[model samples]
Target: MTVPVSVNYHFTRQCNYQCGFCFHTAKTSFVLPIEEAKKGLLMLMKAGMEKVNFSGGEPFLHDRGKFVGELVRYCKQELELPSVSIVSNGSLIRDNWFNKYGECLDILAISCDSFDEETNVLIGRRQKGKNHVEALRRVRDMCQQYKVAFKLNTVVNTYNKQEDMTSHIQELCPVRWKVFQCLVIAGENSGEDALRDAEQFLVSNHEFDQFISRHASLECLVPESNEKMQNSYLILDEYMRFLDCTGGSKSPSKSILDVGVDQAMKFSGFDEKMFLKRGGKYVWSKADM
Candidate 1:
């Protein structure tokens, strides 16, 4: 079997803001010890994992970013992975966090669906107060200060489907703008048993396509429809298990920490064809940027 080239590790599901469309929710509060997490990362790097992206219940949540920061440091300093990045809500990040761990990071992607604060709150991205859009800009500045390639991720849903993002995209000038169609994962944010009811958040495929075209004037736009999103990613659950999202429910492979990457990756259900089709591979290293 070929090595999993890129891996997204959602280390904790404990996010502070409540986005209704969140698929990786805090079903279990358990977090693997920091050392154990590194061991798994080391194994992946050894197995040809070129990039390691830290995500989750706000990657900066635990220990006020020290926890994920150390992992980021370890991946670049010790493991020497080509790319080390994080996908965050941009709320919990602080200046000191960048002072501490930002240098080692290759890219920092902020997930902000709307530039308008009201729309952000309406979409359940944040509570009533403390502007989410402002926080996103703050984080963008920090990324610029640290030379970490600034990136943006926007989940196109019913609320933000018609909102024009051309102005905002040109203003922020992110290296990439990953605009995703709001996806409904059955056991994650869809069914009654799910932690989040994201059925209301979903946009029709045409609506998603419309959003992409509307913002096509921006060069950085990289749209991910639900079909390209479903299995193109190699998602690592908090426990270091590979989450197979192909079946419409998250099915876990044995943790790479316990069983090793190759053996556990068999059940990952990752479609390399789809990953490549979606431009999963890119100039991810900041050194090369």
Candidate 2:
């Protein structure tokens, strides 16, 4: 069997924000025990998994930041994974947390959908009075001070589909700016249990393309359509199981915790070519630091 170069591992589903178009449909709370999570991650590392992006309803929401930090440190120091990164909401992070564990991670990606505070609040990304733009700047500054490569992820949807954010992207100066067309997953962001207001954020393909075109000139910009974004990823759920986001549904494999990585991978639909096309294979380790 061919080894996958990268994997998006969702360690916890305990989040503080309620974005309207969250594809994970992650409203419930769950966090894997730290020891068990470490064992499972080690299993993947042994199976030739070179990169792991720790994601969540919010990874920072677990154990008040200690849990995520320990896992990241283990990956970089012990497992020696070439890439150890985190995709976060950028809300709960603090300078003290970065001082403790930032060196262990290679990339820090914050989800920022809009530059306009009012639009961000309307999309449920920012709370009533919370300043999300400030949070983005703060995280960007923290990443620089900690020597971590900073990246930005923006999901384009109905609310901000036409909002030109080129100036904001330039100001943030992220190493990579991944712009994704909003996606809907069946049981997670489509069915009755889905976010009640998610449907309103769906945009047509043409509209999505238009948004991408507007920012194509940005040197750091990398655009992804739903077709290229969904099943192309190698995702692992909180249980250390492969999560197949194909066909707009969340289909999980038997846990690697139960069946081991090789057997569990047989149940996934990971596309290697797509992975490479999406820049999943890159120099993600903090070699200079």
Candidate 3:
């Protein structure tokens, strides 16, 4: 059976901050044209993809109202996707944007490291100031009002890895605050030693399991259970070009805007037939702990 690949479409490569641990290929300014985004969505739907995750250095900053929202609407209304989500830093999510696109999105994962303002500044979101907290509060409230599933994503890092911080955050807001192990990539840390320090920031399975045991209400999104199915797919470059992996990319396709669904999915080594035949699920486990 061919397992379906959850495509993470990067609408834009631009971001407002220079975080130390970010792995995104964020630039100062760039966006996929409205037409191109539509075609891309069609390709994904034809490929039989089960889910779509819109991610970026900060997707909310893009002119999503003009392009991203349209594609999302098509996926939900026309294609009839099971689920769709967005991953953002929570800096640019405004009231107006949420009011319009909130219904289209299934899950919105807000990346918040610490509730404290100073710690947030250390992470390059200083300009946002108190607005960061306000945004989180607003998004949470909006999610509740709209009856949408909202989640808080906290990436553990050396600078903000306070042992009791998670508990404190849960007390303030009764939402799903999921924790992820920090990946030490270039552009985020000063040196290899800094990356090592970030490793120390990681919480082991046992440690996290124990923590959850104490705070059973805080739910977590575990990685897929099927070892072979946990393959991380490639992402489009800043110019909406095709790539084989995040680090090593090849030439651009005939513009996701120009190609049809069948052509886009069958490009190069991409096996559309297999993908369609074996639609699989993302499995999870806490057994190792």
Q: Estimate each model's TM-score.
A: 0.97, 0.95, 0.70
* Candidate 3 vs. true structure, TM-score: 0.70
lDDT of 2 by residue, 215-235 (tens): 888988888888888878888
Residue 175 CA error for candidate 3 (Å)? 6.8
**Which candidate order results from sorting by TM-score in descending order?**
1, 2, 3
Number of the top-ranking candidate, with TM-score as the measure: 1
| Per-candidate total of colliding backbone pairs | 2, 0, 5
Model 2 RMSD, rounded to 1 decimal: 1.7
* Model 3 deviation from the true structure expressed as Cα RMSD, one decimal place: 6.8
TM-score of 1: 0.97
Positional deviation of residue 22's Cα in model 1 after best superposition, in angstroms: 1.0
lDDT of each: 0.89, 0.85, 0.56
Model 3, residue pairs in steric clash: 1-278, 2-278, 20-188, 224-283, 225-283
- Per residue, candidate 3 scores C-alpha lDDT tens digits across 4-105 of 356667777676665656655453356666666766766667667667777776776676444556666777777777777777777677667667777777
Which regions of candidate 1 fall more than 4 Å away from where they truly are? Answer: 127-133
- What is the descending lDDT order? 1, 2, 3
> Which stretches in model 3 have alpha-carbon errors above 4 Å?
1-4, 64-66, 128-133, 168-176, 186-217, 221-234, 242-289
lDDT of 1 by residue, 1-289 (tens): 8678999999998878889889888898788999999899988988999998999878888788899999999999999899999999888899998988889999999998997777877787884465544788889899888889999999999889889988888999999999999888888898878999998889899999999989888989888999989999999999999999889988999999889999989999999999999889999998788
